[PDB]
Amino acid sequence: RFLKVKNWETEVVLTDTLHLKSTLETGCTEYICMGSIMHPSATKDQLFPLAKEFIDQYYSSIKRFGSKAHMERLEEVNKEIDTTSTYQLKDTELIYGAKHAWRNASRCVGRIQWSKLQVFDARDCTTAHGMFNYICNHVKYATNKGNLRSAITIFPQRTDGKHDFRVWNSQLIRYAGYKQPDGSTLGDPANVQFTEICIQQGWKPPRGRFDVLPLLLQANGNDPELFQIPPELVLEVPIRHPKFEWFKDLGLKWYGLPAVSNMLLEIGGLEFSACPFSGWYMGTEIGVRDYCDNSRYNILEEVAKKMNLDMRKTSSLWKDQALVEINIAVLYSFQSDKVTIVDHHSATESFIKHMENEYRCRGGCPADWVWIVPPMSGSITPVFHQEMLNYRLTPSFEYQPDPWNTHVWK
Amino acid sequence: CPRFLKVKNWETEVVLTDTLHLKSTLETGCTEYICMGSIMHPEDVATKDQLFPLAKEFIDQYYSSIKRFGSKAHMERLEEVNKEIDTTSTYQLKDTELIYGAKHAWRNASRCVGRIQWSKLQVFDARDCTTAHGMFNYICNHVKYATNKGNLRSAITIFPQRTDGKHDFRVWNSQLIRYAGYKQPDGSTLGDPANVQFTEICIQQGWKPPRGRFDVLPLLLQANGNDPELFQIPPELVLEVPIRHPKFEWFKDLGLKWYGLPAVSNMLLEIGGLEFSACPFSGWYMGTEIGVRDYCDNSRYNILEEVAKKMNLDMRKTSSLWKDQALVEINIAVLYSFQSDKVTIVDHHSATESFIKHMENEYRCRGGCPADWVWIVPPMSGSITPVFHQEMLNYRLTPSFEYQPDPWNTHVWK
Ligand code: HEM
Ligand code: HEM
Ligand SMILES: Cc1cc(N)nc(CCc2cc(F)cc(CC[C@@H]3CCCN3C)c2)c1
Ligand SMILES: Cc1cc(N)nc(CCc2cc(F)cc(CC[C@@H]3CCCN3C)c2)c1
Ligand SMILES: C[C@H](O)[C@H](O)[C@H]1CNc2nc(N)[nH]c(=O)c2N1
Ligand SMILES: C[C@H](O)[C@H](O)[C@H]1CNc2nc(N)[nH]c(=O)c2N1
Ligand SMILES: [Zn+2]
C-alpha cells in the first residue's frame, strides 16, 4: 500500500505509490536489511511477459494504451519470440527504454536530467572496429568542447551468451596504474589489473602517472582488440587552486568525461551487455574518491604537508581540512576551463527538486540513500535529511561479471 | 534464509561471514521488494502466552553466556520464571540478568558506533523507586557518576518495568541534559530550536525560564503513571565546555558552549519480554554530534553563516565550498575545547576506526554484528573514514533499545 517519506529538515512528507510496480528483488528481507551491500546476491518462456510488461508501459506513456498500435505490437513481438527466440525493439522503444533505465537508477543523484539523453543506436555493429567508430562519435558528441552532453550508445543485445558485445574497460576514459618493483603504485591503483591485461595484449605503456588507457573492445564474442582514442577527443583539466599557488606544482589533472562502460542495460527482457553512457562529473567523484581514497591516488598526506598542517593526531582534522581544499581546486579548475561540473551542494539540491517532481507526476522515486548522500559534508546537504525508499523498477542498469573471468580466448 | 552471509570491505578487501543474523527477532521494515533502510522510524503489554517464549529465549541466552546451559540452576531458573508468569502475569529479573540484558541491548544497538565499549557499562538498579522525587535522586547520582569531573563513564539507570501500561515510569525529557528553545512572536527562535515543544510543556508545568541561548531544561519525571513533576538539576552537576578555536581568536567571541554528557532518556529497554520504559543511559560524545548536527544543522543553532563571515569566505557561490570549509573549523574548535578542558570526547576518525576493529572482533567471536550504515557513517567526511567502505548487515537482536511514543501524547492526566 501507500508509503510515506519525510524530510526531517523541511518536514515535507511525500506519499509513494510507485513501489507497487516493482518486481525485481532488493536483497533485503523482513529480518535483514542489505542496504549497504554493493552487489547483493533467457528463453521464449521468460521473455514474453517481460516484453509484454515493457510494451504495456511504453504505450501507456504515450497515452495510447490498448490502442490498435499497441495490439499489433504485442502480436508482432509474440510472433518474433516464437520464430527467433528473441525480438528487436523499435527505435522509439529503444530511446524510451534507455531514458527510463536512467530515470529508474536509484543510485544516481543526476536524474533530474533523465529525459535530456542523446541515444545512439549501434545495434547494426558487428566488429570491434565498428564499436571503436561508434565509441569515438559518442565521446566527441558528449564532450562537445567542454559543454558536456549526456549520451548513451547501445550495441547489439545478447543472443546465445557466447556472442556478447562487451566494452572491457569499466569506463571509456581511465588512467593506467602500474605495480612498481619497490612495492608502490604509479598512476591509478584501481586499474592495475586492467592495465596489465592491456600490456599483456600488446599495449606499450608510457609508465606515467596519467596515461589514458586504450579501449579493449569485444564484438560478437570474439577476442577483444586494442584501440587508442585519438587524443584530441580526450578533454583533460589541470587541477589548480584559487588561493594556493603551489597546488599546480602537484602535477594533478583529470579527464572531463565520466563514461560508465561495464554495465548492462535491460529493456523488456532483452540484455544490452555493451551500453556505454556518459554525463558530467559531480566534483566529489574526483576530489574525494579518486584522489583521497587510500586505495586510489591518496594525496591527502601531500596536500596537508604543503598546507603545513599539524598531522600528528587525527583530532586536528587535518584530513578533513585537506579534503575541502582539494575539492575547491577541482571545482575551480573545471569551471575555469569551461568544463561542465556540478558541486555536491547544487547536485543534491537538484535531486530533492527532482524527487518532488517524480512524486507529483509519477507517484514516487526509488532512491538509494547510501549512494545519493555525497562522500563529504553529508548532513549540510539536503539529501542527508531526506528519507528515501529503494526499489527496483525496470528498464534498468545492472551489474554484470567482468569479461576477463568468462571469456574463453582463441 | 541461508546460513552464511558475507560482507566485504571495499578499501581493504577483507571479507567477513555472518551467522548471527539467524537469531534475528523482529522486523527491519524492509521487504524483498522495498528497502526502508533510510526511514528513521520504520497500553497493549505482553500476555502470558507471549511472555513465556520470550523469557525462555532470554534465560537460555543468559545461561549460555555464563557457560551453564542446561545446568541445574538453568532449569530451576526456567522453572521459577514460568511459575511467576503463571501466578503474576510477569516476572522479575535477577540482578545478574538485568546487568547482562542492559549490556547486550547496547551491544545489539545497530545504530551505535561506540559499541566497542559495551561490556564496560555501569548499571544502576533503580527498580525499588516509587516516586518522582526518588527518580530525581537516582538521575542526579547517575549524572554525577557518569560525569566524573570530565573523565566520563558510561552508565544506565533502570527504573521499574511496565506492568499494565497505566503505571509507567517515564523521563519526559528526551535527553537528561538539553538546552531550552523559545519561539519568539516574530518567528525567530532563541536557544535550541529542536527543543521548543518540550520547552513549552515545561513552562506550562510551572518552569520559570530565564530565556537565554543556553538554559538547561529541568527534569520532568513521571513515576508509577502519575502526573510528571519538575526538578532543576543542580548546576554544579552539569559539566559544560566553552567552545574556542586553537587558531581563530575571534571564535570564543561567538559565545558558544555545550554540555559534556550525552544521556538518552526516552528509549525503552526490552529484556526477556519485559519493558523498561524509563532507562536513561549515557556515554560520551563523538565530536560531530555537536560540531556538525547541533551547531550546523539549518534547524538547530545554524552558525555556519556567522562562522563563514568571520573567516572572510566568498559566500556567493556554493562551489567555493564555504560551508564545508567552515564546518571543518567548527569541528576543530569543538574537539580542541573538550580536550583542553579534559572532558572525554572522541573524533570521528578514531571512533570509526575503533568500530571497525570492534565489528571484526564480533564477527570473529560472536558470528556477526548488526550495524546501520546510514547511522554509523559520520555526517561529515564520510568516505575518508573506514566505515564508509564497510558493507554492513542490519538486523534486530534482543535485548534491545527501542523507540516509544512521546509521553505527553499518551498520558492520561490525573
Ligand atoms: C548528467 C550528469 C550526471 C551526474 C552529475 C551523475 C551523478 C552520479 C553520481 C555522483 C553517481 C555515483 C557514482 C559513484 O559514486 O561511483 C551516479 C551513479 C549512477 N549514474 Fe548518474 N550521473 C549523471 C548521469 C547519468 C547518466 C546519463 C546515466 C545513464 C544514462 C546515469 C546512470 C547512473 C547509474 C546506473 C549509476 C549507478 C552506478 C552504479 O551502481 O555503480 N547517470 N551518478
Ligand atoms: C560510550 C561512548 C558512546 C559513543 C561514542 C556513542 C556514539 C553514538 C553515536 C555517535 C550515535 C548516533 C547518535 C545520533 O546521531 O543521534 C549513537 C547512537 C546510539 N547509541 Fe551510542 N554511543 C556511546 C555510548 C552508548 C551507550 C552507553 C549506549 C546504551 C547503553 C548507547 C546506545 C545507543 C543507541 C541505542 C543509539 C541509537 C539512538 C537512536 O536511534 O536515536 N550508546 N551512539
Ligand atoms: C554517467 C555518470 C556520471 C557521473 N557523474 N558519474 C558516473 C560514475 C563515474 C565513474 C567514473 C570512473 F572513472 C570510474 C567509476 C567507477 C566507480 C566505482 C564503481 C563502484 C565503486 N566505485 C565507486 C565511476 C557516471
Ligand atoms: C549514549 C550516547 C552517546 C553519544 N555519543 N551519543 C548519544 C546520542 C546523543 C544525543 C544527544 C542529544 F542531545 C539528542 C539526541 C537525539 C537526536 C535526535 C534523535 C533522532 C534524530 N536526532 C539525531 C541524541 C548517546
Ligand atoms: C533521512 C535519514 O535517515 C536521516 O537524516 C538520518 C541519516 N543518518 C543519521 N545518522 C545519525 N548518526 N544520526 C541521525 O540523526 C541520522 N539521520
Ligand atoms: C559499503 C558501501 O556500500 C560502499 O562503500 C558504498 C557506500 N556509498 C557509496 N556511494 C557512492 N556514491 N559511491 C560508492 O562507491 C559508494 N560506496
Ligand atoms: Zn533494506
PDB file of C-alpha atoms in Angstrom, chain A residues 3-6 8-9 16 19 22-39 241 288-289 292-295 300 314-321 323-325 327-328 331-332 335 343-346 349 367 369-371 373-380 384-392, chain B residues 1 5-8 10-11 21-22 24-41 292-293 296-299 304 317-325 327-329 331-332 335-336 339 347-350 371 373-375 377-384 388-396:
ATOM      1  CA  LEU A   3       4.220   4.632   1.944  1.00  0.00           C
ATOM      2  CA  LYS A   4       5.333   7.994   3.283  1.00  0.00           C
ATOM      3  CA  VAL A   5       8.801   9.529   3.294  1.00  0.00           C
ATOM      4  CA  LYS A   6       9.630  12.556   5.393  1.00  0.00           C
ATOM      5  CA  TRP A   8      13.388  15.881   8.742  1.00  0.00           C
ATOM      6  CA  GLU A   9      14.720  19.371   7.925  1.00  0.00           C
ATOM      7  CA  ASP A  16       4.952   6.768  -2.510  1.00  0.00           C
ATOM      8  CA  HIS A  19       6.823   0.997  -5.463  1.00  0.00           C
ATOM      9  CA  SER A  22       8.377  -3.213  -8.841  1.00  0.00           C
ATOM     10  CA  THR A  23       9.224  -6.907  -9.238  1.00  0.00           C
ATOM     11  CA  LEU A  24      12.990  -7.441  -9.054  1.00  0.00           C
ATOM     12  CA  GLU A  25      14.347  -8.129  -5.568  1.00  0.00           C
ATOM     13  CA  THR A  26      16.199  -5.596  -3.433  1.00  0.00           C
ATOM     14  CA  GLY A  27      18.252  -8.090  -1.424  1.00  0.00           C
ATOM     15  CA  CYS A  28      16.603  -7.306   1.922  1.00  0.00           C
ATOM     16  CA  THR A  29      14.104  -9.434   3.805  1.00  0.00           C
ATOM     17  CA  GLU A  30      11.762  -8.651   6.655  1.00  0.00           C
ATOM     18  CA  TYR A  31      14.576  -9.649   9.033  1.00  0.00           C
ATOM     19  CA  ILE A  32      17.813  -8.456   7.393  1.00  0.00           C
ATOM     20  CA  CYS A  33      18.429  -5.153   5.622  1.00  0.00           C
ATOM     21  CA  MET A  34      21.172  -5.279   2.996  1.00  0.00           C
ATOM     22  CA  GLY A  35      21.027  -1.590   2.094  1.00  0.00           C
ATOM     23  CA  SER A  36      24.790  -1.133   2.294  1.00  0.00           C
ATOM     24  CA  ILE A  37      25.732  -4.226   0.246  1.00  0.00           C
ATOM     25  CA  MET A  38      27.111  -3.103  -3.098  1.00  0.00           C
ATOM     26  CA  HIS A  39      26.197  -6.202  -5.159  1.00  0.00           C
ATOM     27  CA  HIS A 241      43.774  26.112  -6.662  1.00  0.00           C
ATOM     28  CA  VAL A 288      37.063  12.848  -2.636  1.00  0.00           C
ATOM     29  CA  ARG A 289      37.081   9.338  -4.077  1.00  0.00           C
ATOM     30  CA  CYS A 292      41.730  10.780  -1.479  1.00  0.00           C
ATOM     31  CA  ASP A 293      40.696   7.127  -1.206  1.00  0.00           C
ATOM     32  CA  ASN A 294      43.590   5.277   0.415  1.00  0.00           C
ATOM     33  CA  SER A 295      43.462   2.715  -2.423  1.00  0.00           C
ATOM     34  CA  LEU A 300      45.757  13.903   1.385  1.00  0.00           C
ATOM     35  CA  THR A 314      43.641  12.729  13.954  1.00  0.00           C
ATOM     36  CA  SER A 315      41.611  15.141  16.123  1.00  0.00           C
ATOM     37  CA  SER A 316      43.262  18.140  14.442  1.00  0.00           C
ATOM     38  CA  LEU A 317      41.053  17.125  11.470  1.00  0.00           C
ATOM     39  CA  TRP A 318      43.975  17.688   9.097  1.00  0.00           C
ATOM     40  CA  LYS A 319      42.456  15.117   6.737  1.00  0.00           C
ATOM     41  CA  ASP A 320      39.149  16.984   6.665  1.00  0.00           C
ATOM     42  CA  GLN A 321      40.839  20.318   6.044  1.00  0.00           C
ATOM     43  CA  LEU A 323      39.931  17.284   1.721  1.00  0.00           C
ATOM     44  CA  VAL A 324      37.953  20.528   1.392  1.00  0.00           C
ATOM     45  CA  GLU A 325      40.836  22.335  -0.324  1.00  0.00           C
ATOM     46  CA  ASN A 327      37.551  19.736  -3.734  1.00  0.00           C
ATOM     47  CA  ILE A 328      37.718  23.523  -4.034  1.00  0.00           C
ATOM     48  CA  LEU A 331      35.557  22.761  -8.952  1.00  0.00           C
ATOM     49  CA  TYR A 332      37.611  25.897  -9.620  1.00  0.00           C
ATOM     50  CA  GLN A 335      34.902  25.970 -14.034  1.00  0.00           C
ATOM     51  CA  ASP A 343      29.229  20.606  -6.884  1.00  0.00           C
ATOM     52  CA  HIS A 344      27.549  18.356  -4.351  1.00  0.00           C
ATOM     53  CA  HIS A 345      25.509  21.223  -2.858  1.00  0.00           C
ATOM     54  CA  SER A 346      23.921  22.044  -6.210  1.00  0.00           C
ATOM     55  CA  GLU A 349      19.566  20.498  -4.267  1.00  0.00           C
ATOM     56  CA  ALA A 367      16.434   6.306  -4.301  1.00  0.00           C
ATOM     57  CA  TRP A 369      20.400   6.941   0.358  1.00  0.00           C
ATOM     58  CA  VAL A 370      23.716   5.092   0.811  1.00  0.00           C
ATOM     59  CA  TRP A 371      24.778   6.253  -2.685  1.00  0.00           C
ATOM     60  CA  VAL A 373      24.433  11.253   0.021  1.00  0.00           C
ATOM     61  CA  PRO A 374      27.796  12.736  -1.050  1.00  0.00           C
ATOM     62  CA  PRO A 375      31.029  11.294   0.394  1.00  0.00           C
ATOM     63  CA  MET A 376      31.836  14.567   2.202  1.00  0.00           C
ATOM     64  CA  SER A 377      29.872  17.137   4.220  1.00  0.00           C
ATOM     65  CA  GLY A 378      26.895  14.761   4.306  1.00  0.00           C
ATOM     66  CA  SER A 379      24.496  16.477   6.658  1.00  0.00           C
ATOM     67  CA  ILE A 380      24.916  20.020   5.337  1.00  0.00           C
ATOM     68  CA  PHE A 384      21.042  13.661   4.269  1.00  0.00           C
ATOM     69  CA  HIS A 385      17.729  14.614   5.894  1.00  0.00           C
ATOM     70  CA  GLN A 386      15.524  13.034   3.215  1.00  0.00           C
ATOM     71  CA  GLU A 387      14.032   9.618   3.817  1.00  0.00           C
ATOM     72  CA  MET A 388      14.129   7.519   0.656  1.00  0.00           C
ATOM     73  CA  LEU A 389      12.524   4.264  -0.424  1.00  0.00           C
ATOM     74  CA  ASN A 390      14.660   1.968  -2.549  1.00  0.00           C
ATOM     75  CA  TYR A 391      13.028  -0.414  -5.003  1.00  0.00           C
ATOM     76  CA  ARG A 392      13.862  -1.819  -8.413  1.00  0.00           C
TER      77      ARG A 392
ATOM     78  CA  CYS B   1      17.398 -17.902   4.635  1.00  0.00           C
ATOM     79  CA  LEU B   5      26.047 -14.032   4.621  1.00  0.00           C
ATOM     80  CA  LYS B   6      29.237 -12.283   3.561  1.00  0.00           C
ATOM     81  CA  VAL B   7      30.164  -8.632   3.933  1.00  0.00           C
ATOM     82  CA  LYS B   8      33.152  -7.096   2.208  1.00  0.00           C
ATOM     83  CA  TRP B  10      35.981  -2.390  -0.395  1.00  0.00           C
ATOM     84  CA  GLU B  11      39.058  -0.451   0.742  1.00  0.00           C
ATOM     85  CA  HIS B  21      21.597 -12.894  11.684  1.00  0.00           C
ATOM     86  CA  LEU B  22      19.879 -16.285  12.111  1.00  0.00           C
ATOM     87  CA  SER B  24      17.169 -12.057  14.226  1.00  0.00           C
ATOM     88  CA  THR B  25      13.967 -11.450  16.169  1.00  0.00           C
ATOM     89  CA  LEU B  26      11.851  -8.580  14.867  1.00  0.00           C
ATOM     90  CA  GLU B  27      11.422  -6.715  11.607  1.00  0.00           C
ATOM     91  CA  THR B  28      13.640  -4.169   9.900  1.00  0.00           C
ATOM     92  CA  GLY B  29      10.801  -2.643   7.913  1.00  0.00           C
ATOM     93  CA  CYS B  30      12.271  -3.818   4.610  1.00  0.00           C
ATOM     94  CA  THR B  31      10.784  -6.434   2.300  1.00  0.00           C
ATOM     95  CA  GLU B  32      12.349  -8.209  -0.651  1.00  0.00           C
ATOM     96  CA  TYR B  33      10.600  -5.617  -2.865  1.00  0.00           C
ATOM     97  CA  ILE B  34      11.445  -2.406  -0.983  1.00  0.00           C
ATOM     98  CA  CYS B  35      14.242  -1.226   1.301  1.00  0.00           C
ATOM     99  CA  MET B  36      13.444   1.182   4.148  1.00  0.00           C
ATOM    100  CA  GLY B  37      16.989   1.480   5.455  1.00  0.00           C
ATOM    101  CA  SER B  38      16.900   5.283   5.463  1.00  0.00           C
ATOM    102  CA  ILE B  39      13.498   5.555   7.214  1.00  0.00           C
ATOM    103  CA  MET B  40      14.150   6.906  10.709  1.00  0.00           C
ATOM    104  CA  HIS B  41      11.295   5.009  12.439  1.00  0.00           C
ATOM    105  CA  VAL B 292      28.028  19.095  12.680  1.00  0.00           C
ATOM    106  CA  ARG B 293      24.473  18.394  13.814  1.00  0.00           C
ATOM    107  CA  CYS B 296      25.412  23.389  11.773  1.00  0.00           C
ATOM    108  CA  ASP B 297      22.020  21.838  11.056  1.00  0.00           C
ATOM    109  CA  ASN B 298      19.852  24.531   9.482  1.00  0.00           C
ATOM    110  CA  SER B 299      17.071  23.935  12.040  1.00  0.00           C
ATOM    111  CA  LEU B 304      27.807  28.247   9.510  1.00  0.00           C
ATOM    112  CA  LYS B 317      28.914  30.625  -4.938  1.00  0.00           C
ATOM    113  CA  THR B 318      28.275  27.259  -3.318  1.00  0.00           C
ATOM    114  CA  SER B 319      31.173  25.912  -5.387  1.00  0.00           C
ATOM    115  CA  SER B 320      33.587  27.870  -3.210  1.00  0.00           C
ATOM    116  CA  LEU B 321      32.610  25.202  -0.609  1.00  0.00           C
ATOM    117  CA  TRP B 322      32.454  27.905   2.043  1.00  0.00           C
ATOM    118  CA  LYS B 323      30.021  25.776   4.043  1.00  0.00           C
ATOM    119  CA  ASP B 324      32.345  22.764   4.008  1.00  0.00           C
ATOM    120  CA  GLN B 325      35.348  24.892   4.983  1.00  0.00           C
ATOM    121  CA  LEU B 327      32.093  23.141   9.080  1.00  0.00           C
ATOM    122  CA  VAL B 328      35.626  21.733   9.443  1.00  0.00           C
ATOM    123  CA  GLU B 329      36.794  24.671  11.548  1.00  0.00           C
ATOM    124  CA  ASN B 331      34.510  20.740  14.418  1.00  0.00           C
ATOM    125  CA  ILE B 332      38.166  21.530  15.108  1.00  0.00           C
ATOM    126  CA  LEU B 335      37.395  18.782  19.742  1.00  0.00           C
ATOM    127  CA  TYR B 336      40.015  21.308  20.881  1.00  0.00           C
ATOM    128  CA  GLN B 339      40.374  18.067  25.064  1.00  0.00           C
ATOM    129  CA  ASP B 347      36.789  12.324  16.991  1.00  0.00           C
ATOM    130  CA  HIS B 348      35.042  10.642  14.082  1.00  0.00           C
ATOM    131  CA  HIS B 349      38.287   9.178  12.694  1.00  0.00           C
ATOM    132  CA  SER B 350      39.145   7.415  15.952  1.00  0.00           C
ATOM    133  CA  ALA B 371      25.044  -2.267  12.040  1.00  0.00           C
ATOM    134  CA  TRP B 373      25.378   2.112   7.797  1.00  0.00           C
ATOM    135  CA  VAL B 374      23.086   5.138   7.420  1.00  0.00           C
ATOM    136  CA  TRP B 375      23.742   5.978  11.111  1.00  0.00           C
ATOM    137  CA  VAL B 377      28.870   6.804   8.895  1.00  0.00           C
ATOM    138  CA  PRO B 378      29.634  10.267  10.354  1.00  0.00           C
ATOM    139  CA  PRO B 379      27.789  13.336   8.996  1.00  0.00           C
ATOM    140  CA  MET B 380      30.995  14.857   7.574  1.00  0.00           C
ATOM    141  CA  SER B 381      33.984  13.453   5.655  1.00  0.00           C
ATOM    142  CA  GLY B 382      32.191  10.134   5.311  1.00  0.00           C
ATOM    143  CA  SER B 383      34.383   8.434   2.744  1.00  0.00           C
ATOM    144  CA  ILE B 384      37.661   9.223   4.465  1.00  0.00           C
ATOM    145  CA  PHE B 388      32.115   4.225   4.586  1.00  0.00           C
ATOM    146  CA  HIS B 389      33.733   1.362   2.683  1.00  0.00           C
ATOM    147  CA  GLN B 390      32.430  -1.353   5.035  1.00  0.00           C
ATOM    148  CA  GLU B 391      29.445  -3.400   3.942  1.00  0.00           C
ATOM    149  CA  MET B 392      27.092  -3.912   6.896  1.00  0.00           C
ATOM    150  CA  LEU B 393      24.132  -6.148   7.695  1.00  0.00           C
ATOM    151  CA  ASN B 394      21.323  -4.635   9.754  1.00  0.00           C
ATOM    152  CA  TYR B 395      19.007  -6.804  11.835  1.00  0.00           C
ATOM    153  CA  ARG B 396      17.290  -6.728  15.220  1.00  0.00           C
TER     154      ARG B 396
END
